[PDB]
From a paper:
Drosophila PGRP-LB belongs to the amidase PGRPs and downregulates the immune deficiency (IMD) pathway by cleaving meso-2,6-diaminopimelic (meso-DAP or DAP)-type PGN. The structure of the PGRP domain comprises three α-helices and one central β-sheet composed of six β-strands, similar to the bacteriophage T7 lysozyme, a zinc-dependent amidase. The main difference between amidase and non-catalytic PGRPs is the presence of Zn2+ in only amidase PGRPs, which is coordinated by two histidines and one cysteine. We generated mutants to characterize the amidase reaction mechanism and solved the X-ray structures of wild-type Drosophila PGRP-LBPA/PC and its mutants in apo form or complexed to TCT.
Structural analysis of Drosophila PGRP-LB and T7 Lysozyme, along with a multiple sequence alignment of PGRPs from different organisms, reveal the highly conserved residues of Drosophila PGRP-LBPA/PC histidine 42 (H42), histidine 152 (H152), tyrosine 78 (Y78) and cysteine 160 (C160) in coordination with Zn2+ in the catalytic site. In both structures, the Zn2+ is coordinated by H42, H152 and C160. In solution, one should expect that a water molecule would interact with both the residue Y78 and Zn2+ like in the T7 Lysozyme structure (Y46 and Zn2+). Additionally, the presence or absence of Zn2+ was assessed by X-ray emission fluorescence on PGRP-LBPA/PC wild type, Y78F and C160S crystals. We showed that Zn2+ is totally absent in PGRP-LBPA/PC_C160S mutant as already observed in the structure resolution, while it is still present in PGRP-LBPA/PC_Y78A mutant and PGRP-LBPA/PC wild type. Noticeably, no Zn2+ was added to the buffer during purification and crystallization steps, meaning that the Zn2+ present in the active site of PGRP-LBPA/PC_Y78A and PGRP-LBPA/PC proteins comes from the expression cell system. Of note, in the wild-type PGRP-LBPA/PC and PGRP-LBPD even without any Zn2+ in the media, the activity remains the same confirming the strong chelation of Zn2+ by the protein.
Author numbering: 12 to 181
Amino acid sequence: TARLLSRSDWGARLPKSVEHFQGPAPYVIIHHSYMPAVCYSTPDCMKSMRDMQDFHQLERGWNDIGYSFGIGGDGMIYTGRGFNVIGAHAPKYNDKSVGIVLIGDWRTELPPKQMLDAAKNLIAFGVFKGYIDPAYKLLGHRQVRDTECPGGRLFAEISSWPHFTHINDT
Ligand SMILES: [Zn+2]
């Protein structure tokens, strides 16, 4: 069911500037948006992507939306900065990671199946296409920075995914 929607598909503004990194991403880092909240229709999820891009570009002065990709409750994938582009989601990992945001607050609630499947499919495409290292490490934001992101319940879910990696003795 999951489609990869382009920047133009969701009416993205141009990035002010694009910095690349080379070679397949050794890290995949999972986030939740927190705000905006879950979006269930493509129209709402495209607006959610423009809201995050506008917050990051216009209020924070960033080059672009900080995430590599967004996932909606429509079960669609939204291109953010995309593969091999330096992110603004996970300081120290921005130049060697795919930053994937599941739109919504997943502290307590588990994302619906179509969002989890969409995230797993995006990762599989990336490995398939050589954008994600075949030995990639899957992390939650909270493993590399003091944060609740990507929410306790979503963190418990990705802990069950293949390539989920412990990077510290905790
Ligand atoms: Zn995060």
